[PDB]
From a paper:
In siphophage T5, the unique RBP is located at the extremity of a central fiber. We present the structures of T5 tail tip, determined by cryo–electron microscopy before and after interaction with its E. coli receptor, FhuA, reconstituted into nanodisc. These structures bring out the important conformational changes undergone by T5 tail tip upon infection, which include bending of T5 central fiber on the side of the tail tip, tail anchoring to the membrane, tail tube opening, and formation of a transmembrane channel.
However, hdII and hdIII rotate around the long helix of hdIII as a rigid body (the RMSD before and after opening of hdII-III is 0.75 Å over 367 residues), and the plug unwinds in a long β-hairpin. These conformational changes result in BHPpb3 trimer opening, creating a channel with a constant ~40 Å in diameter from the hdI-hdIV ring to the hdII insertion tip. In the crevice opened at the interface between two BHPpb3 subunits, extra densities were identified, in which the 43 C-terminal residues of TMPpb2* could be modeled. TMPpb2* is in turn expelled from the tail tube and anchor its C terminus in the crevice created between BHPpb3 monomers upon opening.
Author numbering:
A (entry chain h), C (entry chain i): 1085 to 1127
B (entry chain c): 1 to 720
D (entry chain d): 529 to 720
Write the structure that this text describes.
């Protein structure tokens, strides 16, 4: 039915030198998407 | 800065010989406190009459220097009394302990050529207040040397106006304290300790602090007689045992209700707080129905948003959460509050005062009455009606009649909620309740003069003003001790629109203090504060000020709330006005900061801290990769973006810093901390360089010591 | 048969300004009774 | 008392003494153990007998206390610790509700009532406090710490005022430095 493979832990470090983005909110709340804290695509 | 009358400036500039006198008004301990006797003193060579009060000369040898800075702390002042006087030596020696926490008010008075007092202060056309506070110590040094002149000096130690902030002033759920009953000595006796005259008749906090842990026996009208719904398979056969219907049967219930007396909190935004159960009970016949009244927040409250039944809120956070358990509506994007249950598919809106919500869920049903706090609100009608019928078990067990929950139990200024549980085989016990409440209604003072207190506000300045003007749960500071215009301007400064992000990026808008999903609400600072009144008001004020980096100072009797900000009209000081002493020091190496750890509760997930670290890559590269963290308070901030902008702003501001300290004559009297100074000094190449006053010390001689601060370009909140 | 409903926790703060009483011992040791730490009836 | 012999005998002696607020001193080769008690026969010291210099200071503001935490072990609860807090409501009201707790060693005490009486007594005693220090000639040799002193000084209202020694220093010239300690009224264990 459904199988999950897990590895690692999300990194909560944020670089405030670059402009703010919604990807940070998506990444910092455990949303499903592809990217890092400084650049996250939330699907 | 404290502006002084124009005539005062003219006299100070023109006259080179100022006959300053310090007027001391001291409070003597005595019986009949309403008859509070004052002893007045002055170090002038002759008695000074000021507003019908004669300040006797002598007995005052010296006065220390008042000092203040941008960090809130209890300033201290010590003044000496001649030890050869008999009255003063007796008072200090045999009563120097009873003098503790007694008021003292030192005034700085310039005397005209005719012996009159020059009206410096524009607020009263009188002297400029120099100090105010309460004595905190004593001490006398009788030094006797043979073949010489002895010495006898009396020293009085004092604390400045902020010593009044050590008080803890928070409504306490205990009935005796709330109603103002006297400290019980044997039997009880009413007194006049109530915060409000109408509290004495408010028995609402009755049954507050008690622990009824008994093996009660209940009579349940069930399972003893009458028709039973059991039909045998055979057509004629029947179940002759009669039960499953109303008839008494013994049943032992081991209840254990421990209602303690905890300090009620204060909330200034959309924050999640627990309940403080003040009344607990179960129906007379059915133990499965339990009434528990929880106390939330204080004062008129905009209403409840949602209730957390044992860590499971009644509304699901997202689409995903709804599958795990039953929910009603979303919070992620629709952001609806609890008020959808009564009005299905309505808009987002807080709860309603005196309205019942039937939260139907698996494991049982829950009935919740939301009683918003109010200065004058009636008793809980449901509980009164039940009491009139003696429906409460503990009412009959203790024998109380219809007064067990009487109409006089009108909980005043407390946003309590009555929750009726239906204990079943699924909800086998009473789970701890928490709720998401909007903050207290807060006054906002428009510049024109009109006010509005119809909603809570996220502004830090106005939250602090409300906390500092309420006697019942804050610092009893009257509004007439505040410069309204300056406070309003600062509140505007903290309301500057921030453009680093869009309003569509934060989905949980309703649960971060945003009352509208479209209108502009990108304030530069937004504090959702929980003011736990258990702690000292000093700590609460410091915690609020640390959120936006403000500073509160009280020099000359006015309470100034100010924030490091650019000014287009700084005070111009030239080096030749200085006493010539100068000291420029560099602190950038010590104060370089390039990262900050932000532990902030994020409403998107059940309110819990996220250990989020904000760092500036460029600063770390300049720092050779070394980590330098500045401790920054994120307790009062729930909006991620405001927290990030605050962190980045502080990190930027911590890159250029110098301390410049010099002195200035009495001409420049009234230089408050955090004031804009335009210091011009051609030898260094400075032409109106912009500084900010960090530390100001006032001396009795008139020398005004200063410690200015230098900042990098456009690092302030105002402009970039 | 037997059912128990619980709520809160006993408050161990004692006001020593008042004269001593056995109710304090009953309350502090978890005896079954009605009252506060400063006034407890142990049954 | 349980005396864990692993710890230094110094620590054990200090722990025993802290229980009842006693004190042990070794001056002149005598191991004198004493406690803050009222005395009806103090040594009479006058200002003139004292050296010229005098110094009276107040410490009430710093040492005001209104609460105490008592982690006393209870035999009833299988000898487990109870976190019991004793506070004086009147003192807190006089303290503007501020909490001022004094670290009090409740170990080696199992009777709850003795612990409560000890806590209340210490809280009462910690309400009035001054430190009077001066210098006395070698004539007054042997003034042990925690000794009763009746200091009389006409310029003040003191006539045989009751003080308690707190720090005696002996020099080779004979000058003896003293630091007395003033207390409230009838706040001693011995007093009524």
């Amino acid at each position: 039915t459904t199988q999950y493979l897990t590895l690692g832990e999300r990194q909560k470090n944020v670089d405030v030198s670059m402009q703010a983005s919604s990807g940070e909110l998506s990444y910092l709340r455990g949303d499903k998407g592809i990217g890092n804290a400084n650049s996250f695509v939330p699907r | 800065m404290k502006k002084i009358l124009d005539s005062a400036k003219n006299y100070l500039n023109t006259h080179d010989k100022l006959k300053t006198a310090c007027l001391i008004a001291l409070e003597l301990p005595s019986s009949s406190g309403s008859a509070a006797t004052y002893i007045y003193l002055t170090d002038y060579f002759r008695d000074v009459t000021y507003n019908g009060i004669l300040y006797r000369s002598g007995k005052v040898k010296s006065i220390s220097s008042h000092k203040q800075n941008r960090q809130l702390s209890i300033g201290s002042l010590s003044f000496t009394i001649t030890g050869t006087a008999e009255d003063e030596v007796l008072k200090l020696v045999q009563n120097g302990v009873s003098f503790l926490d007694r008021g003292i008010t030192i005034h700085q008075a310039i005397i005209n050529e005719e012996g009159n007092i020059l009206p410096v202060d524009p607020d009263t056309d009188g002297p400029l207040l120099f100090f105010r506070g309460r004595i905190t110590g004593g001490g006398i040094k009788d030094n006797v040397n043979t073949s010489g002149i002895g010495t006898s000096v009396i020293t009085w130690n004092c604390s400045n106006q902020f010593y009044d902030f050590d008080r803890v002033n928070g409504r306490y759920t205990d009935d005796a304290s709330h109603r103002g009953l006297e400290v019980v000595n044997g039997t009880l006796q009413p007194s006049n300790g109530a915060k409000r005259p109408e509290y004495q008749e408010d028995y609402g906090f009755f049954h507050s602090n008690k622990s009824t842990t008994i093996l009660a026996k209940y009579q349940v009208k069930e399972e003893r007689y009458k028709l039973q719904s059991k039909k045998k398979l055979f057509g004629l056969s029947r179940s002759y045992s009669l039960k499953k219907y109303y008839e008494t049967v013994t049943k032992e219930v081991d209840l254990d209700f421990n209602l303690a007396a905890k300090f009620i909190p204060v909330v200034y935004g959309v924050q999640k707080i627990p309940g403080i159960p003040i009344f607990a009970d179960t129906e007379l016949n059915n133990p499965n129905i339990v009434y528990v009244v929880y106390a939330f927040a204080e004062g008129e409250i905009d209403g409840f948003l949602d209730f957390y039944i044992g860590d499971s809120p009644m509304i699901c956070f997202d689409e995903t959460d709804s599958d795990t358990r039953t929910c009603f509506g979303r919070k992620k994007i629709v952001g609806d509050t609890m008020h959808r249950l009564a009005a299905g598919t309505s808009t987002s809106q807080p709860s309603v005062h005196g309205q019942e919500y039937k939260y139907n869920d698996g494991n049982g049903d829950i009935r919740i009455w939301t009683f918003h706090g109010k200065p004058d609100q009636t008793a809980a009608q449901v509980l009164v009606d039940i009491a009139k019928k003696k429906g409460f078990y503990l009412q009959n067990q203790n024998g109380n009649g219809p007064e067990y929950w009487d109409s006089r139990y009108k909980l005043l200024d407390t946003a309590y909620a009555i929750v009726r549980f239906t204990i079943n085989e699924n909800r086998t016990e009473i789970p701890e309740i928490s709720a998401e409440v909007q903050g207290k209604k807060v006054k906002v003072y428009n510049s024109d003069g009109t006010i509005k207190a119809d909603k809570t506000s996220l502004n830090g300045i106005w939250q602090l003003m409300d906390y500092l003007t309420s006697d019942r749960y804050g610092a009893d500071i009257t509004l007439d001790q505040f410069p309204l215009q300056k406070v309003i301007s600062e509140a505007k400064i903290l309301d500057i629109i921030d453009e680093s992000y869009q309003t569509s990026w934060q989905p949980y808008w309703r649960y971060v203090g945003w009352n509208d999903p479209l209108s502009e609400n990108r304030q530069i600072v937004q504090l959702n504060t929980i003011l736990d009144t258990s702690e000292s008001v000093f700590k609460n004020v410091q915690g609020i000020l640390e959120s936006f980096g403000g500073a509160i100072n009280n020099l000359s009797g006015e309470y100034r709330i100010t924030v490091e900000k650019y000014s287009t009209n700084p005070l111009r000081i030239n080096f030749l006005d200085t006493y010539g002493d100068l000291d420029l020091s560099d602190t950038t190496g010590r104060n370089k900061f390039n990262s900050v750890q932000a532990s902030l509760v994020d409403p998107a997930l059940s309110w819990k801290t996220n250990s989020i670290t904000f760092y500036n890559s460029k600063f770390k590269e300049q720092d050779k990769g070394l980590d330098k963290k500045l401790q920054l308070s994120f307790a009062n901030i729930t909006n991620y973006y405001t927290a990030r902008s605050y962190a980045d702003r502080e990190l930027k501001k911590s890159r250029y810093s110098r301390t410049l300290s010099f002195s200035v004559p009495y001409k420049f009297i009234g230089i408050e901390p955090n004031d804009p100074i335009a210091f011009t000094y051609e030898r260094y190449g400075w032409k109106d360089k912009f500084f900010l006053v960090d530390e100001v010390e006032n001396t009795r001689d008139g020398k005004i010591n200063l410690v200015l601060q230098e900042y990098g370009e456009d690092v302030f909140i105002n402009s970039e």
